[PDB]
Design an enzyme around this catalytic site. Structure first.
Site, mmCIF file in Angstrom:
data_model
loop_
_atom_site.group_PDB
_atom_site.id
_atom_site.type_symbol
_atom_site.label_atom_id
_atom_site.label_comp_id
_atom_site.label_asym_id
_atom_site.label_seq_id
_atom_site.Cartn_x
_atom_site.Cartn_y
_atom_site.Cartn_z
ATOM 1 N N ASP A 168 24.813 -51.744 -41.955
ATOM 2 C CA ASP A 168 24.725 -53.132 -42.456
ATOM 3 C C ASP A 168 25.048 -54.151 -41.383
ATOM 4 O OD1 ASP A 168 27.189 -51.930 -42.935
ATOM 5 O OD2 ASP A 168 27.682 -53.235 -44.651
ATOM 6 N N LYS A 170 35.230 -46.220 -48.085
ATOM 7 C CA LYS A 170 35.223 -47.194 -49.193
ATOM 8 C C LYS A 170 35.211 -46.515 -50.570
ATOM 9 C CE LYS A 170 31.370 -49.025 -47.205
ATOM 10 N NZ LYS A 170 30.316 -50.036 -46.922
HETATM 11 O O1 LIG Z 1 30.004 -52.249 -45.135
HETATM 12 C C1 LIG Z 1 30.927 -52.584 -44.094
HETATM 13 C C2 LIG Z 1 31.355 -51.323 -43.353
HETATM 14 O O2 LIG Z 1 32.176 -50.526 -44.218
HETATM 15 C C3 LIG Z 1 32.651 -49.261 -43.721
HETATM 16 O O3 LIG Z 1 33.704 -49.514 -42.808
HETATM 17 C C4 LIG Z 1 31.541 -48.431 -43.059
HETATM 18 O O4 LIG Z 1 32.102 -47.330 -42.352
HETATM 19 C C5 LIG Z 1 30.668 -49.263 -42.124
HETATM 20 O O5 LIG Z 1 29.564 -48.499 -41.611
HETATM 21 C C6 LIG Z 1 30.158 -50.505 -42.860
HETATM 22 O O6 LIG Z 1 29.330 -51.302 -42.008
#
Ligand SMILES: OC[C@H]1O[C@H](O)[C@H](O)[C@@H](O)[C@@H]1O
Ligand SMILES: Cc1csc(Nc2ncccc2Oc2ccccc2C#N)n1
Length: 448
Positions: free
Chosen positions: A192, A156
């Site tokens: 999360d 991200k």
């Molecule tokens: O935040 C939503 C998701 O974003 C990314 O893909 C992360 O790798 C993952 O761990 C997280 O839960």
């Protein structure tokens, strides 16, 4: 139709979705098995969150959420109810992370984190105590236990050097004590997805899946321990973090990738990685639109062939513009305002075209996403014995919650794709912090 044919490239058939669902189910089996785990795109990381929770300490817990583009710190109070443990956020504070902090080093970034925690602590007559700290950490982690795992690699856009391959709960304490301003007992680290799931457990024992559709997109679920080959044991279940965001990174989605996806990816902070996420997630959705829009100016079908300076720059078409554009009531006022701010002056038909570009990108996201969840839910069906499988999915994230139609389209598609399943969709209240707390409550009777 000159436009409708460009946007027809976003469409996906029932057969196309089923393919994706089946391919996702296959990468999911590949990530769980020892032989295939190392090269598997869908990492299927065990989370050490288990089906058979013994203990649980009542009282107060600190929770952090790193992984939003914000960084949040909160206090939550776990107690004791019928069948389960209740929780509740009591104090909260958000902090931004400055460009130079996420550009430098892991210790530069984690130092900043420590400062934010202390600021919180002062504010609330807290600084004298050390509490159990839960840490929601929204990136891929290869856990050794509920309180130790190495960050696999940032996603991200996050950049901070010298964190990839290092114990995260490590680098946290290393900066807490590099700043003997305060102390905390770091009891649990979670995803999360996992926290969102756990937060829902109270009011729905059936909640065995967690899903985020926000900046990124990912899902966790309750796997049978005999299938989790990387943890020794066959007793009951353990939550698994799929990291389904990296589905397609081994070419699983190659036939489906459009020019705009190939262009989004090349320009991204992580080329060739997170491809499935890049079709869905918030960090990416507005940029997908921006690019669809730019091609429509080149082909001289939109804005009379003339694009603004702002429209030509990366990340100027925010994801929330997609949502607002789709919320327009018909009068075009909202679509105009967005484009006017973007330094454009659009016609009636220009606004209608922008709307259709948004709907095409956001409908694809919902459908891709539905294939994933259908994958997950159908794998769990193949391990369950009732006529109809009843399952609850805990969900969070701005795309899923706030986008006008995403959820209705998503639901209907997942439903088409999952016969003999009754799915219930619960949205999490403070899922990230209350989840991390509820988990920490249990790993406290497992420690102190
Ligand atoms: O935040 C939503 C998701 O974003 C990314 O893909 C992360 O790798 C993952 O761990 C997280 O839960
Ligand atoms: C090691 C550790 C720490 S927190 C934890 N598990 C749980 N914590 C809080 C609530 C529920 C937990 O478990 C479940 C999760 C999902 C579906 C069913 C159950 C059951 N039962 N294990």
């Amino acid at each position: 139709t000159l436009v409708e044919q460009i946007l027809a490239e976003f469409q996906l058939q029932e057969e196309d979705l089923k393919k994706v669902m089946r391919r996702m189910q296959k990468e999911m089996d590949r990530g769980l098995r020892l032989e295939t785990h190392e090269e598997a795109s869908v990492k299927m990381l065990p989370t050490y969150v288990r089906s058979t929770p013994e203990g649980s300490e009542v009282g107060d817990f600190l929770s952090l959420d790193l992984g939003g583009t914000n960084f949040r710190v909160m206090l939550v109070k776990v107690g004791e109810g019928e069948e389960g443990q209740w929780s509740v956020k009591t104090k909260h504070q958000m902090y931004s992370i400055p460009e130079d902090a996420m550009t430098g080093t892991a210790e530069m970034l984690f130092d900043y984190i420590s400062e934010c925690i202390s600021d919180f602590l002062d504010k609330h007559q807290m600084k004298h105590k050390k509490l159990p700290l839960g840490f929601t950490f929204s990136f891929p982690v290869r856990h050794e236990d509920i309180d130790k795992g190495i960050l696999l690699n940032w996603t991200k856009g996050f950049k901070a050097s010298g964190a990839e391959g290092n114990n995260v709960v490590g680098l946290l304490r290393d900066a807490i004590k590099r700043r003997g301003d305060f102390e905390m007992d770091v009891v649990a680290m979670v995803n999360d997805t996992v926290a969102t799931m756990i937060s829902c457990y109270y009011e729905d024992h059936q909640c065995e899946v967690g899903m985020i559709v926000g900046t990124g997109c990912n899902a966790c679920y309750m796997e049978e321990m005999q299938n989790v080959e990387l943890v020794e044991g066959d007793e009951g279940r353990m939550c698994v973090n799929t990291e389904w965001g990296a589905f397609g990174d081994s070419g699983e989605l190659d036939e489906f990738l459009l020019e705009y996806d190939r262009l989004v990816d090349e320009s991204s902070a992580n080329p060739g990685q997170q491809l499935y996420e890049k079709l869905i997630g918030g960090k990416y959705m507005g940029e997908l639109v921006r690019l669809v829009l730019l091609r429509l100016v080149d082909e001289n079908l939109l804005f009379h062939g003339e694009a603004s300076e702002q429209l030509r720059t990366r990340g100027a078409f925010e994801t929330r513009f997609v949502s607002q554009v789709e919320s327009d009531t018909g009068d075009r006022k909202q679509i105009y305002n967005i484009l006017s701010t973007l330094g454009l002056r659009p016609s009636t038909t220009d606004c209608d075209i922008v709307r259709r570009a948004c709907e095409s990108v956001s409908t694809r996201a919902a459908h891709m996403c539905s294939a994933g969840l259908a994958g997950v839910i159908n794998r769990m069906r193949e391990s369950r014995s009732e006529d109809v499988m009843r399952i609850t999915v805990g969900v969070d994230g701005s795309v899923y919650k706030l986008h006008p139609s995403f959820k209705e389209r998503f639901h209907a598609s997942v439903r088409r794709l999952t016969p003999s399943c009754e799915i219930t969709f619960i949205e999490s209240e403070e899922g990230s912090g209350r989840g991390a707390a509820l988990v920490s409550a249990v790993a406290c009777k497992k420690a102190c």
